[PDB]
Design a binder for these strands. Structure first.
Length: 100
RNA sequence: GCCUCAGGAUCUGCUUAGAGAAGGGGGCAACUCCAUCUCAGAGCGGAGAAUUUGGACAAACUUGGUCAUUUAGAGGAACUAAAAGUCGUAACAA
C-alpha cells in the first residue's frame, strides 16, 4: 500500500541519521587531518571505526557536536571517547593504543 | 520366503524463485549490494516403509494310485505233541 512506502520513507529517514554520523567521523580524520600520522592513517581509520561501532547514537551526535565545535581539533574528542570506551570495558586499550 | 513390474507413505539436499519486512552498507532525491524468520510456486533430485504384477523355488493339505512291512477274522483244512483211548492188522518172514 501507500502506508508501507511511507513507513519505508520514515525508516530510511531514521537510517539517514545513523549513517552520516559514522561517515562524518570517517571524514573528520581528514578535515582535521591525520595529525602528522598519515603513515598510520589506515590504523587511525580502523580504530575510529571500532570507536563509532562500539558506541550509541546519542554520543555519536554528542561527539558530532563536539567535532563541529572544533573542526581542526577533533583529536581531543577522539581520545576522550577512547578513554570512555576503554573505561566501559567493551573494547581493549591495545586496539586503541594511539588515542588512549 | 526369494527375484522382477509397479507403487509411494515418509525424510532430505540443490538451484532459483516472489513477497513481507528485520538489519547494515555505500550516490545521498534516485539506485545498488549483503545478510537474515517465513512461505507460495517451479524444477533438479536422492533415500524410501506399507502395498502390488509376473516368475522360479516350493512346505503343508486334499484326491486317488502304487510299493514295502505288520495286523483282525466266524470257519476250514492242516502238521506235531503226549505211560498204557477205540477199530482193523497193511509192512518186516514168500
Amino acid at each position: 500500500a501507500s502506508a508501507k512506502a511511507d513507513k519505508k520513507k520514515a525508516k530510511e529517514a531514521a537510517k539517514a541519521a545513523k549513517k552520516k554520523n559514522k561517515r562524518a567521523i570517517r571524514n573528520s580524520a581528514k578535515e582535521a587531518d591525520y595529525f602528522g600520522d598519515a603513515d598510520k592513517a589506515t590504523t587511525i581509520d580502523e580504530q575510529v571505526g571500532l570507536i563509532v561501532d562500539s558506541l550509541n547514537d546519542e554520543e555519536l551526535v554528542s561527539t558530532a557536536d563536539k567535532i563541529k565545535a572544533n573542526a581542526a581539533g577533533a583529536k581531543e574528542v577522539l581520545k576522550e571517547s577512547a578513554k570512555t570506551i576503554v573505561d566501559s570495558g567493551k573494547l581493549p586499550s591495545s586496539l586503541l593504543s594511539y588515542f588512549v
